[PDB]
Amino acid sequence: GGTMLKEILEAYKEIARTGNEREALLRAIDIVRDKYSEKGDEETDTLLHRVRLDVREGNLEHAVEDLKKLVEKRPELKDVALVLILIMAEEVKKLGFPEFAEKIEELVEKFAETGDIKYVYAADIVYLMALVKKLGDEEFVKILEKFYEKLLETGDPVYSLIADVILLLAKLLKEGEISEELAREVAELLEKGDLKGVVDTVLLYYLKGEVSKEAAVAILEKILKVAKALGDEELIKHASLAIEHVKMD
Amino acid sequence: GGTMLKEILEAYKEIARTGNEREALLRAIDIVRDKYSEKGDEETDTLLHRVRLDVREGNLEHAVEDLKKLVEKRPELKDVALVLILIMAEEVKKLGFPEFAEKIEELVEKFAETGDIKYVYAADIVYLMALVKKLGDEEFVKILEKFYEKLLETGDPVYSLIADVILLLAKLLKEGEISEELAREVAELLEKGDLKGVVDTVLLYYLKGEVSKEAAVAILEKILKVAKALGDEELIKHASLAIEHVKMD
Amino acid sequence: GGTMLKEILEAYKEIARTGNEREALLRAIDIVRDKYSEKGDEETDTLLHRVRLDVREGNLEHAVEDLKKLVEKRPELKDVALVLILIMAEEVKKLGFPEFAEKIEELVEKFAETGDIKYVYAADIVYLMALVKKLGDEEFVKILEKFYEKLLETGDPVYSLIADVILLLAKLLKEGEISEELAREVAELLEKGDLKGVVDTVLLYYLKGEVSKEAAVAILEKILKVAKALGDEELIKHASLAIEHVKMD
Amino acid sequence: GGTMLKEILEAYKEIARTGNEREALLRAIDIVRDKYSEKGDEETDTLLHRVRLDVREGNLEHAVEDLKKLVEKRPELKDVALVLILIMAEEVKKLGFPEFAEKIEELVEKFAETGDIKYVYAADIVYLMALVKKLGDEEFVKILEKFYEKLLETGDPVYSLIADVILLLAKLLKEGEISEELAREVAELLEKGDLKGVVDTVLLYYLKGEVSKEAAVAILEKILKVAKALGDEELIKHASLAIEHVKMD
């Protein structure tokens, strides 16, 4: 938090002055891996090996995916979060949206001289609006932006999960899965204040025969994940009953 | 021990006659991985994958680190030890010290036609000497040389741990951590016969306010690791009391 | 508390009008022993027997010692406390300090028409400064006086324990044990606010080789006793680690 | 053992230069009681109180009895042993045998500059021959002298128990109990090497109707105590069967 983190960012800046934008990331990964290899941390060493290999390959999306997994299970690591956000920003620059890249750069600058994971979550959500904008839907970006604004003033780690659910809805909307009406209804529900009515809406559309069993199960599992990080038991039971009804019945 | 080991060294010699010094190591790693993949050994297969990838990359130090971890946890594997020593020799040749390279080459020659892990430990300690000489301190090399001489005539696997502690002292001496006086005192203590007085000296300097909590703790768990392979309970308890005092108090 | 206590003091005053100052104490002890013998209290009857025998002998110091023990383990008894305060009052009159005797007399007068053990503790500490002044050190009396003032306005039973520690320091200072510098440092530490720094100072001087194992153990167990009546677990563990390091190592 | 014991003996010598021979013992007891009262040792403090009271009374025999009990149960304490031997010597001088007084004085002189309990046992046995000589029997003194000679060259704490058995035999011989023949037989048996034959002889005389149930039982538990400090299970069982036969049958 302000120490041993600004050094990594500084080194990334020096190696990025050339403009390669790829070797600086590798050097940062190598710095983090040296620190986590001297300890008895093999799970982090292997994961950083895989991340470095993927980054050198060019498949950064898988790297951000499993790094997101790692930071979610164990968020005590902060340098790992820093290199994660660096990769997220670099991938955003590749995607073709420079304003999101600038926002993530400011988030990195503020997080390096701080130590709060809420900036990590905010950058993750910026990446999610970047992906949504790449997908084609534009109206979804508004709710993501509202969540990003609300996170920088609340610091609730539960907001990113809702944005993940929105990303799942956008992904399903494109392949040929659940129609637009359900997507808009669920987006509005998660937008205003609604998490319980989302379950009821999903069940209603499933019974009426508008949603296949796989999509409903995926959305309800995401809702259950959101509810499990909120300390709500009247909604965990409600989602459990919903999924149980959906799968076998 | 004299069989199925001299074959690997012979093949490394044939492929090294070209002078590439990189592909022969890869071929040896591939020979070892084939033998350990035909079995139900996935922990060795993955580690050899990582080692081969690192060797092809050129970051041999991480490979020697995790191979050292593997051989310390599992000393029964001897071909893995052989390729380990080959990697140490190749890295030493890169570092710029040819005399240490010659010494470790003779160690490989003797170990191939034998089967004793004490040569592996001796080569490791020669590596640590190489690293210390690269760091800048020269007086530390004398104690390492004395330990290396004593290991070839005793075969006690605990001598490498003391050299590892010396390497840690040298590393801390360079970054900006604990001053020279403590380093010299601890080096002399581990040199002559002293392991218990080292703990007392570290505690004394901690209480007087000359050593930060991190470096003292590091040296203390290193001493605890040294004592845990010596069958000493009067020193394990002493080190445990020392660490408990240092961390929370 | 104001009843069945003022009667004993009144009788002591009547029998002390003659001026023998020895038989009145015996009569008070016999009054207390009659009351505690009619019950099923044998541990008190025997102890009062011993106290009366010692008082008639003239060795009041042993009597005040074991009566202090008794009142510390079981402070519900108040008449026993009253005769105890009478005993240090008489002993102080023998020692040659009349002002301390006057202070103890006022404390007896206030305690008889009250019932608070804090006056017992205050008179105990007065006895402590009397003994300290008899020993020869004068600077130690100031901290004892400060503790005496602080007890009459706080009523915390832990203040007498610090005075006991100061007494131990003064006693060790005279025989030929720990030098003056450590005594002054520890006195200042216990004076201002420090109990944790005392342990560190004692350990530091032990490791440097200025204090024999017996004196350090005595001071540390006294500090442990002080901390055990303060509801502190971060200091009980700290003192336990200190003593464990000191004795066996 | 050579320290903080010679000081007590020196003080006893100074106070005994007057020739009172009674107040020096009281001063030594008071020194020991001060040391054992500062601790949490109430069992030793009370017993020293009783010993001092008995010594001032003039009934030293009870004091030596319960001090013997104390040193037998817990012989780690050595100063109490020193004051015990001092009381033993003083009582010997009162009895009227100056040669035994000289012997025990030399024993005190050697024990003070040493620390071995075998001198305590030797002085105890000297007291036993003194008591036997006072009783009237003279032939019994020879076996006691032989045991005393053998103890100073063996250091076996089991020899004093046999002398205690001899003392019991002498005591029973005088009141009107068991006749001389059994006493001589048992004395010879205990003298040469016999402890098992003593049990058989006692049982034989009991069955023949020469010894009442009380004296036989007394000698039998004395023999059992002797055998219990010898690590013999073939004799403990033999004594247990003997006592069981004697009491109920």
Ligand SMILES: [Zn+2]
């Ligand atoms: Zn690795």
Ligand SMILES: [Zn+2]
């Ligand atoms: Zn519902």
Ligand SMILES: [Zn+2]
């Ligand atoms: Zn149904």
Ligand SMILES: [Zn+2]
């Ligand atoms: Zn594989």
Ligand SMILES: [Zn+2]
């Ligand atoms: Zn009584």
Ligand SMILES: [Zn+2]
């Ligand atoms: Zn401490």
Ligand SMILES: [Zn+2]
């Ligand atoms: Zn120590």
Ligand SMILES: [Zn+2]
């Ligand atoms: Zn007492």
Ligand SMILES: [Zn+2]
């Ligand atoms: Zn028999």
